[PDB]
Amino acid sequence: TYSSLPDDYNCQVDLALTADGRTIVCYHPSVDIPYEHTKPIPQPDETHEQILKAKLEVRKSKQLEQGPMIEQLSKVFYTTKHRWYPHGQYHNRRKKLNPPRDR
Amino acid sequence: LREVVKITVIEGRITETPKATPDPPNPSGQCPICRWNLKHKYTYEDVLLLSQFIRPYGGMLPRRVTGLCREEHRKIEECVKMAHRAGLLPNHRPQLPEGCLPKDKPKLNRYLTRWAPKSVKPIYKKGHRWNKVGMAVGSPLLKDNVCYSRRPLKMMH
Amino acid sequence: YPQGYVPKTSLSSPPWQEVVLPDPVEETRHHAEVVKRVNELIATGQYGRLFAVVHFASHQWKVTAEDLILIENELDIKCGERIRLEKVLLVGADNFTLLGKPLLRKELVRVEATVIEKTESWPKINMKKNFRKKKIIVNPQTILRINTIEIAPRL
Amino acid sequence: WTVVNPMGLLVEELKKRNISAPESRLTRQSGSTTALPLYFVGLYCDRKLIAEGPGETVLVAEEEAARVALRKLYGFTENRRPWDYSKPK
Amino acid sequence: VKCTKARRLKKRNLRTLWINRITAASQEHGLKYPAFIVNLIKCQVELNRKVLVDLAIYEPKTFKSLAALAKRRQQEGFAAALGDGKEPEGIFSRVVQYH
Amino acid sequence: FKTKGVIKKRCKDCYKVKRRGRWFILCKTNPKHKQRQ
Amino acid sequence: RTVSFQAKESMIRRLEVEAENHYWLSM
Amino acid sequence: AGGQWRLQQGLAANPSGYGPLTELPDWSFADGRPAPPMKG
Amino acid sequence: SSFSRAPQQWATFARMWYLLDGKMQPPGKLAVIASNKLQGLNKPVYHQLSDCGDHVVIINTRHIAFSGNKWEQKVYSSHTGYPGGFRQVTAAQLHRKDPVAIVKLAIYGMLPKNLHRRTMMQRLHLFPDEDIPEDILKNLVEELPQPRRVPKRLDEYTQEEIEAFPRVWTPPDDFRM
Amino acid sequence: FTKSRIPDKVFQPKPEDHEKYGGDPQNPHKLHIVTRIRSTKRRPYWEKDTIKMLGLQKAHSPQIHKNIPSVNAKLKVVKHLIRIQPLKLPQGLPTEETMSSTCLKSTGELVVQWHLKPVE
Ligand SMILES: [Mg+2]
Ligand SMILES: [Zn+2]
């Protein structure tokens, strides 16, 4: 209990100075989540696609118009409508076909 | 404490009152606050201290009975108003006549209220950067309280 | 009630909570115990990948085996030559780390690199107007691959 | 290496090691009822955590918890000691 | 002209980014950014802000240890100043001299 | 009620009060003596 | 128009350094 | 940060001043042969 | 570690649901906490281009507290755009009309004055009282400490506590009280 | 706005001043360490010239000067733009052997053996 940070969330912090006093040694083993702190999976009845379709039910006028479809999409993802409207062809042709990729 | 009872025949009966806790930490203190080394360490939040100087209906007791010095009387009196306005003394409400009831409005939560809410005008023209009209918070009487912040408290908000 | 006693109030005590630090004598024993535990882990090789913070040029790099590092200057080393980076400020593993004050000992940590490429930067435009009052800056560069980080039980 | 149903493979491995069948449980959870939910599922053996996985759905988090467990069994963790090219052999 | 001037504002904007990320990581462990940076220095640790961010994002366990170390040095500082007179210096407040 | 910059009592019966954010001198005997700041 | 806390502290620092300059120039 | 504290300990205010971190050589050959001195 | 590329990316950039309780809390200290969470400034992976904000749910916004006389002195001003369309309404009057307005406006001012601020406000959910929809409850991950320490009223003080505090002075028996 | 003559009293120290700064009124130090810490821009031209005469064109770079009245007279002109610190020689003046091993500390000490090693 020498460590000044509680050891109950991320790892157990142990700090020690070497005899000469030139090095600080840190021992930080992980803390595993206790079994009592978990919940059971709800086995009785699922892909993220299926969740999306149920959320975006096509009810009004069969395939919805832009304004209705975009307004519903914005509510589901907690955004504004503007994100969803398309862009012209000056912008579409400027985009890189092969952007770089770091790993 | 003597109370008058009526029957007409009216009589006042004296009853024993609890006495001060013995052995004050700092004897030779003239005023009660100073005897216990509380000169600059009480604020409106300290109801336990303030309630001792309050009448059952929320009024302040006279200076002579309490014995407080003028400087601390003013400070104690001011904090009680702020304590009353902050809703910290629910059992010391006014003695409304039987023919009256509370205003029945919802109550806005307040704290550190210098003035009576009824008589403060709105600041319509607030002013620009080095012209701002300031909204007072707290009481100037308490400027001399011990401060545990890097710089003095911001009275004007 | 002792001298200088104030009943509890809002302003009586500081907002912060005073702490009681462990007694020095017992902590020194604990420090030795902790150091020994980590030292045995190093001796038995109970660790995986290592990462070190190394001071090179005028910059600090969080580095690890197989990493690539770009240096904004010539280094005087031929391509393909192995080098040892000698300033390590921190070496870490999954379960432990060692910190220098400000640098670790030579014995504790040995980091080795290789010079893979010597090149020059792309043309950078400096223009303090005209379109011809322009200077193009290319500066020499070197890329270093980091090959190994090794530690020994000399704690 | 391509593997389908990594749980079934994991069950076989633990059986060979004479270890009890893992029990899947929900360690951490966020925004379950939304369209962007985060689920953390941990496989518990004998009330001891062997692996934990992140996922968009509870089923997805399960398949990853199994993967995050086979690696630790076969020593293909991401922090495993780097390959040794220093060897003169 | 803009390209040349942005070259020098780039270096100040990344340092602003590093500080914001460090304040995020330290507040997770309960430390304000000024305390974390200052007390790490008083322990003779010369990790820079760019490296500190890398520790916070990719080495959460090592960063947590630094927060405890900076908290411990801060805790020692309060005791040293709070107790006037000659009191033995804190274990982690010892300074390694160089010559 | 005259709104003046300085409030001064004008008779013995005049008394002072602090109502609705302002200072008043109110005299029951002589209402002419009333002043607001 | 008041003078900031930064402004008054920093000048006093400079005054103290200049105060020492007075002393070292007297010997 | 830390400039005033460093001065009290006798160190340079800026960690890039006189000290082991800057003045010590940044590398040496794998063979152990010392590297040419730094221009700075 | 040991997560695949896709789940690891999902876990890092997932958005979290938080709960604030505004009971007796000043609106502007709630805004400081709410504004920080909304921008994603509480995350070490924060970047202005990364859309890493979080959801903030605030309850009991009807029972916020203003220091001083701000209820009567602080004024909110709006214009419809038509001649004679200027309105100035005090904080108390705005509170009565809309229980949630004061907190929402306080948070709005704190966010950066750019296009993304309007997206952040979508993530904010304000309820005047403790009532919450069933679905919103399931999303919640973590609660948050209140910024202001709520002083106790006399009634809340326990009988033992009153005894512990000393009687500084004693009333004389010759007093009506 | 013209050059000013400072009263002599300014440069006459007091007994407590010796205690604070730790300098003996006897055995006065020989050499100054002078660094410019403010800019000569927006300063009168005479101040600009004395700074160039003393070699303090670059800021925060120390220059060594004689603690003699003629040098002091110029230093008093630019007293506000510089920091004066007494040079100290803990290990004595550098010799031919130790000329290449010196280092000037922030404390004002010119050490003649500079090892860059723990004190141990
Ligand atoms: Mg800068
Ligand atoms: Zn009259």
* Resolution of the PDB structure in angstroms: 2.8
Nearest-Å Rg of the Cα atoms of chain C is 26
- Spatial separation of the C-alpha atoms in residues J15 and E30, rounded to whole Å: 49
Q: Which ligand is nearest to the CA of F15?
A: 2
Residue I111 exposure: Cα atoms within 13 Å on the Cβ side: 25
- Spatial separation of the C-alpha atoms in residues A70 and A51, rounded to whole Å: 18
Opening angle at CA E39, ends H11 and B153, nearest 5: 115
Structure tokens at B68: 């407080």
Closest CA to I14 of I43, I36, I35, I41: I43
- In chain A, which residues have their Cβ closer than 8 Å to the Cβ of E65? 11, 13, 15, 26, 28
Beta bridge partners of residue C69, listed in sequence order: C144
- Spatial separation of the C-alpha atoms in residues F36 and C2, rounded to whole Å: 54
- Spatial separation of the C-alpha atoms in residues E59 and I147, rounded to whole Å: 30
Closest CA to B109 of I58, I71, I101: I71
G19 Cβ contact list (under 8 Å, min separation 6): none
Structure tokens at J120: 């141990």
Q: How far is C-alpha B4 from the geometric centre of its chain's CA atoms?
A: 28
G1-27: burial string, b at 16+ Cβ within 10 Å, e else: eeeeeeeeeeeeeeeeeeebbbbbbbb
For the purposes of burial, counting CB atoms within 10 Å of the CB of A61, is it exposed (0-12), middle (13-18) or buried (19 or more)?
exposed
Other C-beta atoms lying within 10 Å of the C-beta of residue B8: 4
- In chain E, which residues have their Cβ closer than 8 Å to the Cβ of A26? 62, 65, 69
Q: Tokens 């493979």 belong to which residue?
A: D9
* Phi, psi at F18, each rounded to 5°: -125, 85
Closest CA in chain I for residue B137: I68
Opening angle at CA B19, ends B13 and B22, nearest 5: 165
Structure tokens at E68: 């405890």
For the purposes of burial, counting CB atoms within 10 Å of the CB of J22, is it exposed (0-12), middle (13-18) or buried (19 or more)?
exposed
Q: What residues have their beta carbon closer than 5 A to ion ligand 2?
A: F 11, 14, 27, 30, 33
- In chain F, which residues have their Cβ closer than 8 Å to the Cβ of B77? none
Q: Which amino acid is at I171?
A: P
Cβ distance F27 to F10 under 8 Å? yes
C16 Cβ contact list (under 8 Å, min separation 6): none
Residue D60 exposure: Cα atoms within 13 Å on the Cβ side: 20
In this complex, the chains that touch F, judged by 3 or more CB pairs closer than 8 A, are B
Chains J and E touch (3+ CB pairs under 8 A): yes
Opening angle at CA A27, ends A23 and A31, nearest 5: 160
Q: How does DSSP classify residue A32?
A: P
Residues in chain I: 177
- Spatial separation of the C-alpha atoms in residues C56 and C62, rounded to whole Å: 11
In this complex, the chains that touch I, judged by 3 or more CB pairs closer than 8 A, are A, B, C, D, E
Name the experiment that determined this structure: cryo-EM
E39-42: long-range contacts, CB 8 A cutoff, minimum separation 24? E39/E69, E39/E70, E39/E71, E39/E73, E39/E74, E39/E77, E40/E66, E40/E69, E40/E70, E40/E73, E41/H1, E41/H2, E41/H5, E41/H6, E42/E73, E42/E77, E42/E93, E42/H2, E42/H5
Chains E and A touch (3+ CB pairs under 8 A): yes
Q: Which ligand is nearest to the CA of E9?
A: 1
Q: Which of H15, H26, H35 sits opposite C57 (nearest CB)?
A: H26
Q: From its phi and psi, is residue E51 left (phi > 0), alpha (psi between -120 and 50) or beta?
A: alpha
H9-18: long-range contacts, CB 8 A cutoff, minimum separation 24? H9/E95, H9/E97, H10/E97, H10/J105, H10/J106, H10/J107, H11/J106, H12/J106, H13/J106, H15/C102, H15/E46, H16/C58, H17/J106, H18/J103, H18/J105
I127 Cβ contact list (under 8 Å, min separation 6): I57, I58, I59, I60, I61, I100
Q: How far is A19 from chain C (nearest CA, A)?
A: 7
* Contact criterion met (CB < 8 Å) for J117 and E98: yes
Other C-beta atoms lying within 10 Å of the C-beta of residue H28: 14
- Spatial separation of the C-alpha atoms in residues J90 and J92, rounded to whole Å: 6
- Distance between start and end Cα atoms, chain I: 72
- Spatial separation of the C-alpha atoms in residues F4 and J87, rounded to whole Å: 72
Q: Which amino acid is at E75?
A: Q
- In chain E, which residues have their Cβ closer than 8 Å to the Cβ of J90? none
- Spatial separation of the C-alpha atoms in residues B101 and B98, rounded to whole Å: 8
3-class DSSP state of D23: strand
Structure tokens at I133: 């929809």
Q: How does DSSP classify residue F32?
A: G
Q: How far is I137 from chain D (nearest CA, A)?
A: 9
Closest CA in chain C for residue E89: C24
Cβ distance F27 to F14 under 8 Å? yes
- In chain C, which residues have their Cβ closer than 8 Å to the Cβ of B37? 4-6
Cis peptide before D22, with omega less than 30 degrees from 0?
no
Q: How far is C-alpha I174 from the geometric centre of its chain's CA atoms?
A: 51
* Contact criterion met (CB < 8 Å) for E97 and H10: yes
- Spatial separation of the C-alpha atoms in residues C96 and C105, rounded to whole Å: 17
Q: Which amino acid is at D38?
A: L
Opening angle at CA H35, ends H32 and H38, nearest 5: 150
Q: Which of I4, I17, I141 sits opposite D67 (nearest CB)?
A: I4
3-class DSSP state of I54: coil
- Spatial separation of the C-alpha atoms in residues G26 and I93, rounded to whole Å: 70
Cβ distance J35 to J106 under 8 Å? no
Q: Angle, to 10 degrees, between the axis of helix I116-123 and the axis of helix I27-39? A: 110
